[PDB]
Amino acid sequence: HFEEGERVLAKHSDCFYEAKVLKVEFKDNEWKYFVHYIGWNKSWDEWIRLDCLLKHS
């Protein structure tokens, strides 16, 4: 659904932030995405699930 390198919106807590997908993995019948939040410390990088992601536009 999303690819390595892709600009996306990623939900953290209550709202969506500009982010970039760094890694994609599939395990236990589900996709997960390691995302970086644009402009933010790398310490906030995290694995999130598909329903936490939005394509732009």
Author numbering: 51 to 107
Authors' text:
MRG1 and MRG2 belong to the MRG protein family, with highly conserved members in fungi, plants, and animals. Members in this group have the same domain organization, with a chromodomain (chromatin organization modifier domain) near the N-terminus, and a MRG domain near the C-terminus. Firstly, via their chromodomain, MRG1/2 proteins act as readers that recognize methylated H3K4 and H3K36. In addition, MRG1/2 proteins bind to chromatin that contains tri-methylated H3K4 and H3K36 via their chromodomains, the bound MRG1/2 in turn stabilize the binding of CO and ultimately controls the activation of FT transcription.
H3K4me3 (residues 1–9) and H3K36me3 (residues 31–41) exhibited detectable binding to MRG2 chromodomain (residues 41–123) (Kd values: 0.8 mM for H3K4me3; 0.69 mM for H3K36me3). To obtain the information regarding the specific MRG2 residues that are important for recognition of the histone marks H3K4me3 and H3K36me3, we determined the co-crystal structure of MRG2 and the methylated H3 peptides. The proteolyzed samples were analyzed using mass spectrometry (MS) analysis to determine the protein sequence, resulting in the identification of a region containing the chromodomain with residues 53–123 of MRG2 as suitable for crystallization. MRG2 complexes with the H3K4me3 and H3K36me3 peptides were obtained, but the complexes with the H3K27me3 and H3K9me3 peptides could not form crystals under the same conditions, consistent with the ITC results. The crystals of MRG2 with H3K4me3 or H3K36me3 were diffracted to 1.68 and 1.65 Å, respectively. In both structures, the MRG2 chromodomain contains mainly four beta-strands. However, the predicted alpha-helix located at the C-terminus is missing in the electron density map. For the complexes of the MRG2 chromodomain with the H3K4me3/H3K36me3 peptides, the recognition modes are almost the same; therefore, only the complex of the MRG2 chromodomain with H3K36me3 peptide is shown in Figure 7A. The tri-methylated lysine projects into the aromatic cage formed by the His62, Tyr67, Tyr87, Trp90, and Trp94 residues of the MRG2 chromodomain. The co-crystal structures clearly indicate that the chromodomain of MRG2 can directly bind to tri-methylated H3K4 and H3K36, and provide strong evidence that the aromatic cage of the MRG2 chromodomain and the associated residues are essential for the binding, the same as other chromodomain proteins. Consistent with the structure, the Tyr87Ala (Y87A) mutation in MRG2 disrupted its association with H3K4me3 and H3K36me3 peptides, supporting the idea that the hydrophobic pocket formed by the aromatic residues is essential for the binding, as with other chromodomain proteins.
